[PDB]
A paper describes a structure:
Remarkably, the final Fourier map did not show relevant density beyond K64 of either protomer, which would be compatible with the full-length molecule set up for crystallisation being proteolytically processed after this lysine by a trypsin-like contaminant. The protein is a compact almost spherical pentahelical bundle (α1–α5) cohered by a central hydrophobic core, in which the N- and the C-terminal helices are nearly antiparallel, so that the chain termini are adjacent. Helices α2–α4 form a flap that folds back onto the two terminal helices. The two protomers in the asymmetric unit (a.u.) are related by a dyad, which gives rise to an interface of 573 Å2 (ΔiG = − 2.1 kcal/mol; ΔiG P-value = 0.42427). The main participating residues are L3, D41, T44, L47, L48, S51, N52, T58, D59, L62, and K64, which are provided by helices α4 and α5 plus the linker preceding α4. Finally, the experimental structure is in very good agreement with the predicted dimer.
[name] is regulated by the [name]/ImmA tandem, which are a transcriptional repressor that constitutively blocks transcription and a metallopeptidase that acts as anti-repressor and inactivates [name] by proteolytic cleavage. Regulation of [name] is exerted by the Int integrase, the [name] transcriptional repressor, and the ImmA anti-repressor metallopeptidase, which are counter-transcribed from the PimmR promoter of the transposon.
Numbering used by the authors:
A (entry chain B), B (entry chain A): 0 to 64
The structure:
Amino acid sequence: AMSLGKRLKEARQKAGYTQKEAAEKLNIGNNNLSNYERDYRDPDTDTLLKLSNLYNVSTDYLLGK
Amino acid sequence: AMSLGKRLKEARQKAGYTQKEAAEKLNIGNNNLSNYERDYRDPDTDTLLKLSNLYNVSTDYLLGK
């Protein structure tokens, strides 16, 4: 009931970005970020780091340490 | 010249585990762990968290944050 996708959404909301704002800044298609936030797709570790970087959180936070 | 593979290797050696001891604790193939340490294959985020747990390190560390 808690997931990486849910923390990615929440962290993006904390940073102020809309989905398309975040995707375009990360040069990822909008559907891909949507798929990640919904836990439909597991991000590769490079992307995981880029998103931690854009939202100003630790990847440890997103993963549920 | 530095990579996730290289930090997983170092972090595992710091924890004291051999490659197969670590593979067996996490029930992943010895070849699979070797492929990760060698940067031949990207760990899925689940495996990345388990290994960070087994070595007592941050996923941020392994990722180069």
